[model samples]
Target: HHLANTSAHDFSYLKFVYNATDTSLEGSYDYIVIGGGTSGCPLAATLSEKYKVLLLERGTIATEYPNTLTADGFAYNLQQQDDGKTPVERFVSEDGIDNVRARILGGTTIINAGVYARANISFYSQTGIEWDLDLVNKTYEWVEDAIVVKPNNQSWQSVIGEGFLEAGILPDNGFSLDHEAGTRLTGSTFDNNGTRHAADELLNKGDPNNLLVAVQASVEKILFSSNTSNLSAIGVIYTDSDGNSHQAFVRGNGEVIVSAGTIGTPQLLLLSGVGPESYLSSLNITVVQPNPYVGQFVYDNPRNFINILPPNPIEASVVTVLGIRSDYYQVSLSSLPFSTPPFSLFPTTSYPLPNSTFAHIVSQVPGPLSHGSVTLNSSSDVRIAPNIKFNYYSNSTDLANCVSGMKKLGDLLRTKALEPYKARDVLGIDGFNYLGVPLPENQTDDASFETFCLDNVASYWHYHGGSLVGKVLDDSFRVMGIKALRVVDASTFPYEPNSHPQGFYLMLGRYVGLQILQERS
Candidate 1:
């Protein structure tokens, strides 16, 4: 029932008691949430069960948008032309990778392929964040029950699994949540009918009256107060859809939670004067506190793919069978029934080839030695896109590992089960051609693979680490040297987890909410 109402513009839970569109905000809130995206939605909802919560989103609420409500419309949402005000902003990185940032209520979940997965066990042990294992598991259960789902085993998806097994990828673990070495059927956010679910569904868990969600409310800065000994966040200044400004404060001991994702969170903090002192000074931004780690050491999972054209039509599906290698690399096998245009790294006019069934062997490295940074192009404007430097493959080891993973992909394609479907070697022959530059005739040589990776590797878009736990914030998710402020999103992750971060983001939101509730009790 809640999922049905999600598509209605007048959904009951979305009707805020005090919408900034029509009325000005007054008095104070027990908690203020910036960025009503993935983690922010659940975090605000959980807090609102008892305390008065204010949720501010930069984009308008349009759950009914075709791309957002269906599984097959993912690329439509991502490829939509931005009017500079749409919920999704498109940009290119300094290293020439095309990417997007969600500006909507559900954030990137609204545009992603809807594959759901849990973080690897090493995520908890290696990050150094003190997690109460039992409590964290409970939180994950709550999130999973609300939005996660088992994808329908379509013909193409089933074959992908069989192909993986035939390729000697190890034990076929059926359907599972644990991350281990094997071929396993993973979960997805799309239901059996192909209806999509997002983190915003968790908002239904809160008391409607206690929660106020403002759409098209862009937070400009975090309002703060300081004494000789400490600095504290009090509220935020934001603008409504009509360009009208408003200020909302927090009640006694209440907190400001920033869930603007890995990019926006650090940019917001720096805009509010909490970043490197010298860098801020150069931009003429007054420093509230110098925390050098605010936007440094950022990383992304470098994703590369091998495309295969099948001899016949195949069912459309996202990821189905995943092969986890011992070197912390992940391989995904899935099929696309339609021709999706490839992203261009440079300016080049191109038209789509004929539609054909295709399979993609996507590989990702969980641990990367290369890291980058996020910085402001202008001190006063959040609208000015941040300068994102994704120094991917800068580390020699990362490049070597990527080459090794590609070799593994070649091995899988040559498997007996998959070799039959592989198309002949000619452009448009059997409706298939390699997705990128043609593979070298001799892939056995390490030099050839290394050169190919250096020329074509792109970001997986599973970005993490800007306000890292030990560097910018404490294990409790609170920003170091700042009171009444916390980050409960991917930005707080110490490193990129082996799996997609959506499931872990939901868990983080619920876990942080529970922690706050427990402390108050």
Candidate 2:
């Protein structure tokens, strides 16, 4: 079932099932889970193990594109989108794709580039979550094993990829994957076969009895008991693509989990009448239970690009490789025709402490120096558009930190390790040229060289965080002030992790699943 949105990039083959304009229902479900992509996949399958589950997806099934099933095919889709030949806009579109969730069976997992990195373990403890490392580690192992997470094979590594790896020899925490605060490392969300493995496959598990995977359903709201004075969720209210709404009733008989990611989950809650007190009241949405943090601390990184080299004649396809720094940074190297890998950097300012002067400063940058947020545009449940205001360079310290990071790169490039590949520093085009200059016995200030990073820094599109901890969900991964509704995806992260979110979100899903089971059983 599919609902047609005016800006939908691809609706050529969809069979229009039902339009909500004609019909709506007051129905209930035992467990109505939203979103069928990313973390939602695992949450649905895990919860299904104990009860009848109604999983809701906003997209179509992956069977439409057979290639989507293969690892290379997955990477191919990302490449196509980058080249403007495919539907990648859905991932980053402001009006069309921003509020969109993968409506397909596997969800966005079907199309995302198969890159994986584990979340920092620090997040689990820092958030109000009570789980210790032992439990969290075990959960990570379970998710990794289920998804078979690993780096892409050497065969797929581009020339620039190897160069960046060699460039790491300059040091300064630029080489290993230890949890120690500032080490540079590369590990992605791919299996040995180079395919993306997250909740999609792990939840299906090839055996119907082990997991029940549902597709083509969209949940509109959560049914709660009316104490007239107190509000509580008793079940879920949902509809299929046909626009027929129904209630799958559940009154302490089962649970309802909303893992619809940052955007979807919060929107669903607000539509169901749960959110900021003032905002809900303004919209005529009854403030069932006010949770001030429902949509606060929204952290989304801005993306900017530094294209040093022009397009080369080489006919190789574009590819992506990544590197990470524990709690300090993250970088993704795109295989464009540049002398060096196109690195995506995730700097520390992405996470700002509440009320810190640094936080406000980071919010005021020309380019977002720190993270931003997502809020509802209206009271409509189908209203997916979010209000985004990214504060790029709000913090002066963050800008200084970024400058320092660029300085490090410039210094590292001058070292014997990366000298061979050093082209005219496009970043330093007006700054300096240490390329032909003789190296000093000791490192000193390289003003001309350092100027490059100051001018050209790029934003990486790995966006996360609309409903963060204390704002959206409690430490237990449950929606704040609510029961039986949990969020187990990138949206729940308190801040950006030191690495990619694939492992971390999966781990969270597994851990949250365990907690849900333990709490109920």
Candidate 3:
């Protein structure tokens, strides 16, 4: 839990960050960025270059939690007790699958397996957001130069890279950050020395003089003023950790942007009276805008898993190697200590993997067709997790994709490259020491295989879509029927960009910030 060279040398931009108290409430800024997560950090940092930016986060500084800074601490961070201030927040879907999201300043990037890859080529076009292709390329390179690390593949990563090849995914796309089909060694946020360079670190590029980051400042409601035709988000009312309330407003043509992530973004909108009118009325929330889709069309990518106890110890690796097949189904390998906690459909105690390190190959259905919605609980507390139902595999297309992905994963396990890890008992049963859900014995059974995907499928945690483009927000991401209010995170995405949300959000934060400046210029 220590950084190498742990001196407080750099981070002078942290001068912009404050543990929010009522004493520190800002009067006004050119832009108000809520939630300093994957997108917000870069967004606030980039926006501050030309405008005074206010970044309010519901959690403390990422540096305060050293546990989230190393590659080895990946599993340890996930299993942390949710003490309301932990780096990660634990939540569950209505389907009973255990899910977790970030609560710290860096947001989910603090907790994610730090793989960095741009979205697939058509991802922008599919979103129907007009793209400046040249600017998009430039934006991606800027973030990459700032944080992306070319991983030096170690034992387990090398093994999986070859395993994907032996499984016949394709000709290798070795060590490229491009979103390609077939086995690839991708970019990571974890350096070879085991240090994590998360999105919050991007603030090192910000003009600190123009940036103000206030942590533990939970935004209560977006304050708006309505003209005859529409409403404009003028400011917001927030409460600091000291339970002290503060009001912050925007200046000139400044706007309020929500980078509060998929869950928090929509929750803040609903809490501020921006959801369906009837729903807001039911909660006694004064309706600001009657968009019927603020909290709709939510989704979580489904993960098909095959975990087994390997015969020998493998070094800890996270997001180092991944295999993509047909572009829709992608498989990645993550090895953790065998005593991984019961956080998913995988029950830890059922099979006491008390001793050695084990490897689990997870296949994710990218851009899952299945979708759900987010709603408020009896208490509309943004601090508490919102009610989410990902409705995994509810779409026939998603189930079909899972069947293909699972079959591919099953084939990879049987590949010649992975043969050494297959342990046999004294009785001479030549097979893996399966843990949690065993791989289906019948690889050809497409019928029950579909059922298997639904039965044990877990969330890959790449959920997005709530406050969708064209539904809640315009092409520029400003909320429809509401001026000076926009959502600039994955919450604005209609579907997740194919590779991962972390890389895409970093680029998006910078991309949108540039656009905001271009518009003002």
Candidate 4:
């Protein structure tokens, strides 16, 4: 029962009405899913293909919410306060740069750069799932096709690309445009014309038999019956914009999946009184099944950057250093060493690693051994502020590697090919001197330079793993103790993918959706 009258070119309008005073329940449906963000959108659209489904979004659809439609406009949408007409504000601290994520109907996809990369083969293979490489590969293809995935043409943006080349990185020939070793391209679910092809644009069909699209509804709780021994999800409790609550009866025979992103899904579960026993009790939320892992490994890449402007403007010297798998060694060393090199051929051992000014640098010893955690700030509010403690190099081996990598970058700069552009060091290590002089015979004694590197080299925001994979959700994407529920977003990563995650996250949602349907059916 797909929409026969509508074409991909045509747009349909869904109206929203909200009022806090009107707290009455509205109507009942077969299933209710909350937060129409990344994972939620595709999950809802797919489930709607068979069972009756209701998808709730706290904000307006992307088309109507112009601010959510453009990357630059993301700032405007995120800065908005909850005035009823606008969604909640996307707040950032002064020290942290403004990174915007849309709260509109289509969620963050509406404003993301759209650079999607699959998880590294090694990482996925190591995951404890029954699926093998061949199976996972096929899943990637299916996801790519369904989402109309494509790399933005190399010609799209000039500045970001030119910068990479200036930095001495060459374009990787593998994966064509997908491999961004040394190139600049517009990222995301967009075509050449800067139009979004997110699930909202391509997947939802507005027909229950094929697909369904719901807007202006916010899911409040997952409805379950306690009398049954199987612990089946009955339906969901939600509220429309008009503050009208409703319980949609999901034909209880089928399963209810939660595709809300890392943040949304856990928030819903905790709010519904299902989470770690201590956490729930602290929030005064009742314990459902006492799953201690609900929000355990929350993570996101914390970002900091080194902003360097060359002394002489090379016509194109500003570019985005892309690819999570690239020689991160260069960037990693510039900051701190935290892990040992996978291979020993690369300087297996040494002390006071060259080019570092840190008082002690032992090669292959991982340092900056600190760990960060995400904890609930307030129970009354589901929203959370990320508390990150980045011990850059927790292992001594890692610190040693950082020193090595930084020295390498210095050597690269001295290459004859780059000498002509060797303007005096515009960016300097706080305590080191680069004055027309050679480094002392003892390369390891530069303590001041090491301190500067520690303070300067910034993080690349590739954060992942805030609700680790196996620990947070089962292989089938279901929460360990919850029935008819799943988490299908970035938060499922046990650790950051070796590269960009946009595409992989989308694939994850689709794969998890099919798995749910097959198991339930």
Candidate 5:
């Protein structure tokens, strides 16, 4: 029986034929995809159309965990302090910056705010990788049709859109998925009824008999057979739910795909001794392939936002209209529903209560000149979190761009359209004075605003670049020095796209799947 023929939400059917976590059974497969997250789910499902595939995920399935499947469960899934309870592993970087990576079968898609926007067209050509732009665009349409939806235009989102236009964001392009320099309504993964969709739905497109999905299966390393001159990935070793180890191999004309995200991919590579030789030797791991570029050039979209407490209650909404600037800086307005408990207060002094609706004017600076790296702490433990450092705003250019973007956000807030809202700054002098320095009487000056930005820079979770193309992997996403192994996740991006990477990750998965199918054909 094909797993795809069974209802996705049917627990009995899932437990009967699809779920494979209890028993230790192994066989040779045509494709083994690690990390059944955003990319791996689609890639495995696509390949399963013609090949036997195995999808291993460290976290539980989203359907089995309904808390992560609701439109309003974004924070619930993301803010979990305990990694054992949630599918998200939260960590703070060396520079005091906090971040998270998806541990569930749907990966970050299960926890993200669900904004689905396409990458800028220029991003395709920016990297030296040879890409079929037409095919890539088609893949975007394919994935968009499956998961993207137009959000209901709430009053709060509409006012924010109008304010963006009045602030000289230029010609309003209306509703669009294209990344352009104007204000436009963005797509989301949540539908009109507030149902959240995930990439796991793509699996339904696969042949059930050919695809095997195993949740709570953590891949430890990529097994390889090596000679003096060449090395090839032959299989993978993973641990099941009950702490038992298992091995799965690939048959003739098969391949292993790593879609374990920006951090996990590189961490896994290093654990498999496929990274910098000096670093690997330091950890007492034998170097299978001494690829020095396995974990470099990591970056995230640096974000800074001002919190405004509306005078009256406002409707809850996600990010809708985005203000894109020519400099790759974006400003977006979003509000949290009053029903959500106020966990933290930005301005400690301004508001004594948590009953009012809160709006956030967020500024995102993309195309950062600064970069970071992921390194291993242990020689053989895959569960040990990698040492990640995102030196955001470390470069003068990145810092200046962030300051410029924040200034634009300030301008948008001052627009006449938003005047009636009577938005009060909770972080200003009357508020908690959270900034390192006191807020200026006139907040428009670049000096004071830059200081404020320097004190409160954060990431928007759009992480990219670790096992990058042309460095760790080739244009086809195959590892540069290895055979029958490829990466198809955020880590493979040579440059950070100037938007949320979820949309591109999906398109890349479909594009690479087609590429592999064509090559085999």
Candidate 6:
């Protein structure tokens, strides 16, 4: 209704966009991309440019939930409890941090703070894979052209940007999409209208006739066949909401690309018996392949934040300003308060929040050197979230990174740039302080502040790894010793791809899809 004849929601009107119960769903496709998510959507789209592709998603489209489509609904969306079909599925890692994974068709991209940043130059070299630099740049441009936007910072975000400069984050780079040092205005997936443009939209860039997308299709496990010592993926087994089973095969020598993300991909592999033989036997799962590295090396970036109650009313933002280095990431004005919301509202837009309004700036360790693992919490059932442990701050280097980050945040918070917002007036302030405890005044020293970093550590939720390049996979992303199978999502990343990994996730999907096409030819 808002635009032209050739519109953008390509996944919607296509004839092949079906539910698991749809009778028209075909038995085979040239390529089957599981988990229609941040990476999977674009991966399927790119492959459909030349070959038939099937994209399977456990949840329905983002539009069905309504909240996943806009910035105004972000916090509201995450707060909702899961009931098997919500857009976000809540989980607590074994380390005792609360987190959520995207349960909808768009994957975690639908639920993230839509700040967009590219992978730094070193990120490519660190992977040990020979990625095409020129094509990587081009792929980013391809995805950005469909979605990202320059946010109008208004009063709140503008002040935050200025605060970073005053606190010595270095030369302000102003507005940019590149991942650069110093404070700068980063790109947002949320546009001026507050609407989100995510990886799902990139589906329109593919060959419409060659693509098939099935919603509410929960894949149970990969189906593989063994010939002597060789194991090859032939298809997958999935179920519908009513527990009806279906099988979709890769046509002939076609491949099965797993893009189920950091958690789901590993869970799926383990469930399919592609894990270590001893581990599988312990769980009574039939061993398909005995690989010990399927679910190891998982990492989530450690984010430490300073929560404060602002005296001034601000705007609800999804991270317009950010510093590229360790000290800062972004800020959010929550639906809390002294009484009113954190930001001046757009009518009935931000409302009915559970807690008081609060504002906070985040400090993060990008590419945390620390890593951990994900294991079967119970032996079976994909519905239960796998037991995961990031072992945050386990590596001495990560603790030092977190230490430097929070130390700088202490300085940033105390700067005159943030002085006015500190709730200085008595009648205005009263018993309500900064809501939470302010940063320790004792941050100047070593161990005392390091303890503070430890006490408050949380997740940036930029988790990656589990199936890393050159470990579980070759540089080409194909699983070692397994034919017609590959993992194409964040699980394949050994290090953090960026301050925000969404940009790299999108690029990798398109990148791998292009490579698959060439190698097949």
Best by TM-score: 3
lDDT of 5 by residue, 442-462 (tens): 655778777777777767778
Residue-level lDDT tens digits of model 1 in 98-158: 7778887877777676767788877788877778889888777787777777666776667
Please give, for residues 1-521, the per-residue lDDT of candidate 2 as tens digits.
11111221222212322222223322343455667667666666666677555565655456555566655454344433232122232333332122223445555566555444555556555665666678876665665555543343342234433433454522334333333333233444445544444456555532244333344456777777777344456776556556666555554655677777666676777777777788889888877777766655555443322222222222222133333332124232333222221112222223212211000001111223465555677676553544654454455655654554444344434444333333444543322222112222222454442343333333444456667766666777666666656677777764565434555666666567667777777
Which ten contiguous residues of candidate 3 have the minimum total lDDT?
Answer: 1-10
Q: Give candidates' CA RMSD values in order.
A: 3.4, 9.8, 3.2, 9.8, 4.4, 4.6
| Maximum-lDDT candidate | 3
The candidate, 1 or 3, that scores higher on TM-score is 3
Q: Rate the local accuracy (lDDT) of all candidates.
A: 0.75, 0.49, 0.80, 0.48, 0.75, 0.78
Candidate 3 stretches greater than 4 Å from native:
1-10, 226-230, 332-354, 378-380, 425-430
Please state the error at residue 449 of candidate 5 in Å.
2.3
Backbone clashes, candidate 5 = 1
Residue 196 of model 3 has an lDDT of 79
Write one digit per residue (lDDT tens) for candidate 6, span 425-497.
4432222345444566565577876787777776787889998887789999998888999999999986776
Ten contiguous residues with the weakest lDDT in model 2: 356-365
Model 4 segments beyond 4 Å from truth? 1-30, 71-101, 132-171, 174-188, 205-211, 310-371, 383-462
Off-target runs (Cα >4 Å) in candidate 5 are 1-20, 23-25, 226-228, 331-355, 423-445
TM-score per model over all chains: 0.92, 0.72, 0.94, 0.70, 0.91, 0.92
The TM-score that candidate 1 achieves is 0.92
Give per-residue CA lDDT, model 4, range 204-306, as digits (tens).
4334353444566666677777854666567777666666666665565555666556556666666766678987897677776677766555443332122
Residue 498 in model 2: lDDT: 43
Q: List the residue pairs that clash in candidate 1.
A: 87-103
Candidates 2 and 6, the one with greater lDDT:
6
Clashes of 4: 51
